[PDB]
Paper text:
CDT is a member of the Iota family of protein toxins which also consists of two homologous toxins produced by Clostridium perfringens (the Iota toxin) and Clostridium spiroforme (C. spiroforme Transferase, CST). All three Iota toxin family members are assembled from two polypeptide chains termed the “A” subunit (CDTa, Ia, and CSTa) and “B”, subunit (CDTb, Ib, and CSTb). All three B subunits are presumed to contain five domains that are involved in regulation (D1), oligomerization (D2 and D3), and host recognition (D3’ and D4). Once proteolyzed, the mature form of CDTb forms a large heptameric, soluble structure referred to as the prepore which binds one molecule of CDTa to generate the toxic moiety, CDT.
Further classification and refinement of the CDTb dimer led to a map with a final resolution of 3.56 Å, with local resolutions consistent throughout much of the map (S3A). The receptor binding domain (D4) was not observed in either chain in contrast to previous structures though additional density is present, indicating the D4 domain remains flexible during toxin assembly. Chains A and B are arranged in positions and orientations that are similar to that observed in the prepore structure, though Chain B is rotated ~40° about the central pseudosymmetric axis in the dimeric intermediate, as opposed to ~51° in the structure of the prepore, illustrating structural plasticity at the dimeric interface during assembly. The surface formed between Chains A and B accounts for ~1,200 Å2 of buried surface area and relies primarily on structures formed by residues 411–423, 477–484, 504–513, and 534–541 from Chain A and residues 237–240, 278–290, 427–434, 439–451, and 490–498 from Chain B for assembly. All residues contained within this interface are also observed in the structure of the symmetric heptamer, reconstructed from the same dataset.
Residue numbers in the entry:
A (entry chain A): 218 to 315, 319 to 451, 457 to 748
B (entry chain B): 218 to 313, 320 to 678, 682 to 746
Amino acid sequence: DLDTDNDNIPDSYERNGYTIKDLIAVKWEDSFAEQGYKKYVSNYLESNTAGDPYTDYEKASGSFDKAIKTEARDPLVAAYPIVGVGMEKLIISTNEHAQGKTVSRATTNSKTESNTAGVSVNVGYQNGFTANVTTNYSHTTDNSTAVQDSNGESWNTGLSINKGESAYINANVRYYNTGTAPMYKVTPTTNLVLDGDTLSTIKAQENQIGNNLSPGDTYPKKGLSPLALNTSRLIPINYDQLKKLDAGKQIKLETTQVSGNFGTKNSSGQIVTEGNSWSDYISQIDSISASIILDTENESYERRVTAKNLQDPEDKTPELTIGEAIEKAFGATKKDGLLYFNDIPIDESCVELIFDDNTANKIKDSLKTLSDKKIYNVKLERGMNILIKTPTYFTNFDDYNNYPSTWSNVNTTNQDGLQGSANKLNGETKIKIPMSELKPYKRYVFSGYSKDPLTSNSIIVKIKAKEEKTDYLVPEQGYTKFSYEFETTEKDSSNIEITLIGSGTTYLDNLSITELNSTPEIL
Amino acid sequence: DLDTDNDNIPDSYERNGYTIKDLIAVKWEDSFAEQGYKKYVSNYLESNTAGDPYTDYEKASGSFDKAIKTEARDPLVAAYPIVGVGMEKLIISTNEGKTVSRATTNSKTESNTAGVSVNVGYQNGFTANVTTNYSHTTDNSTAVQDSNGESWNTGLSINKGESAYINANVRYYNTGTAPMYKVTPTTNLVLDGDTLSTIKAQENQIGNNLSPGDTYPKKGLSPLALNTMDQFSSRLIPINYDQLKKLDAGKQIKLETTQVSGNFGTKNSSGQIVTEGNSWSDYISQIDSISASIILDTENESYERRVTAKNLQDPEDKTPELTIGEAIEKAFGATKKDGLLYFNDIPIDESCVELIFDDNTANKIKDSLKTLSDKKIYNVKLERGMNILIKTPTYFTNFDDYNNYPSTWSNVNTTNQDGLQGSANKLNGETKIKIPMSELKPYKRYVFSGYSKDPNSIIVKIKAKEEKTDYLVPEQGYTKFSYEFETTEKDSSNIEITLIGSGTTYLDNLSITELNSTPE
Ligand SMILES: [Ca+2]
Ligand SMILES: [Ca+2]
Ligand SMILES: [Ca+2]
Ligand SMILES: [Ca+2]
Ligand SMILES: [Ca+2]
Ligand SMILES: [Ca+2]
């Protein structure tokens, strides 16, 4: 009944109930939950709940641009375009025109690789902190290129460079967008950085790309030829970074400044993109909201959710926990105590959580007074960065099981697990997962949960690879988390074996294998 | 409720303390401290107490652009941006070819503490240091890194009459409480007074906005090289043989940004943000000649604020006067508990950190300290034209809950209550501390400060690049003492501090701060 800002939704509805249907607003009474209606929250002193250029009525009723992802319909999630720059194939040639000695290798681009290259796990996690801290944090704008089809051969042999001259560097690139917003006049600037030595900056301009970049869409639309860097000239190199590229180091490719417009619906007809720009609302959006990155093993996402400053009594904004922020940002079906993706069971004990130092200190300070000892029941504060890594393989001895092979000596007729059922242990437990299902020259982490209701009934684990190891683990009365690294080798090697021997009392649950980063191959 | 200046705040509420809740202004009742509210005071003749474009109510109610810091919420602190430039790498080639590449570290406040002079024993209640040359956070100084004694011309076969070329890596930062929309720097480059070449950059080549605390090369990214410049695309900065021989000696490259320009954000009826008609040109001249400057330097970050103050000899202005401590608490996000100020966890006080004034205001502080009876420098009034710098120690102990040293002090007992603040040490025997060079920066200048009392002789011994032993007789009260030393490179020995007393003496608040960088 009371209106304050320039929105049709009243003051009494802008807290504790938000339903919008047939372009009018009605409250929430938990009765139309499964008819496609949801409940939101917003402020009451500002027209825009975030820094986006849409009002809270204009973004929670569908009366805005149709190209925006539907997860940004919630007023606590801001539309934000993030353009990243990807590499596919590296071509080196020794001519300045476009014959000569040329080599060409096939690479894969990794998005969240420099973020999690400074993560080292412990054998046991003290207190209830079930997450690790990274040395540095980077968003999904930079990429690291890993060469796969590379036998033992130097780059200098294929070019025959003696003292002072060198060859030229050409590449194949693509232009991805991972966020809940499109751009229209896309003009990105990107450094091609080799460990601090900026070789060149590529600017795509306008006519080489087109007048659109839809969210979740590259410029080569799925199955198409990649964009080579010839259509605005070649990139040179010298004979001091060739052995630097040869021995251990990899080419980083990072965008720095990205310019573009946005579309607003006019009075009469379709959208316009002339008098708008995504360069002014970026500073407004980034100074109020947090930053959550989700890394599914086939695609990546990154969102900004507005938070609450707890050292302010005047500030009236909604406050969220970590799990509610994840559910509102990425979209998650709420199963019985669980958060679900389309097929991925994200939770606090089924993924890997990465924070930087300030976020880790804030969470470790806040977890002392919590009465439930879980990460997801932590209040959100403005200015933290969270990374979620979905493991490649994960089983919980339940309806979800996607390991390439099957285990041995597994009994599932029990119910005293962390999430429902568990695995009774009697003797040995073996798994021989082959190298053909594993990416070569990487680093992997095997993580799991253990529980034994006895005094000193321990277990031994053993990981067999090129760098094999054996470990001894003692459990406790409660559920304890263990993590162990191993490193892989090229595709012409043996299988990866994981063995563990118990003593007939211990219980295990939530066994997962995830990837961390790439190791340098000796060349 | 009579209103002389139109800002929808009554003059009776504006003269005393007042606060804002539920988007209305109410008086101060001295009971909102535990809830989280704060008190404000503003002039009643002018709608804008400071020279900022925002009015009193808009600044004091948080209705401005949300990109500024929340420490500019009070109307007595201006909100204007102070951008700066730092330099992180050096590449020299003789090509218009050999190439030499080295790494450098930048310091924001290094010309501020270049000319300070330390002394043993402070013969007043002043307990502070006086500098000769004052430089803000806009100026910055760069220092070279590990070269193993190699000459800078042994890789470049250049004789007299030829010119080498400078290629550098530049990182742009902000240290204020305002975003800098449409930034355009016009920075310089000086070596022993000689401007080699100015450096000019435009809006649409670096980040168009600079939010206040962010960086144009983002954290985890790479610095912006000057080879990726429009005007530095075919020529570089020339260098003669005399200039490179000066750099080979004890000299360093400093960078000072002279003048910047751009707009600021506002609010619109139809849209939200426009940054065209506004400008940060005619407002900086109002801010810089009406207020006083405070600089804080914590071990990872520096801040610079400007706080408006009452003029002395002119009754005609009614700006609210402040003490030094209240202005320090208002300028930064400082929380006061038990009579002590804490910024976030690092303490700031008159006896805990090293505070430096310039030469013009130290006489004013010393003359105002004679009339005061508390004999503390955090109680003197603030006038127009004071310059304060605060340096927090890297290592500091008070024999209490706060400790930062990487090695435990030997022979320490804190079961007393007769100290200056909290518990204190008793030197029944002698205290010793070893500290390794891996925990310290190489080729720097450090000072070590503390407080001693004897209700006897105290012999101090510092092992450094020059070992120094000295004697000090303490008085019945408390006197601040300090001793300077210098360090050596990374692969040298450790650093020893030994303090031997007489049995009936007390020590408190032992700190080590960094001042300068010695030339190699
Ligand atoms: Ca409303
Ligand atoms: Ca509203
Ligand atoms: Ca289970
Ligand atoms: Ca006023
Ligand atoms: Ca007024
Ligand atoms: Ca003390």
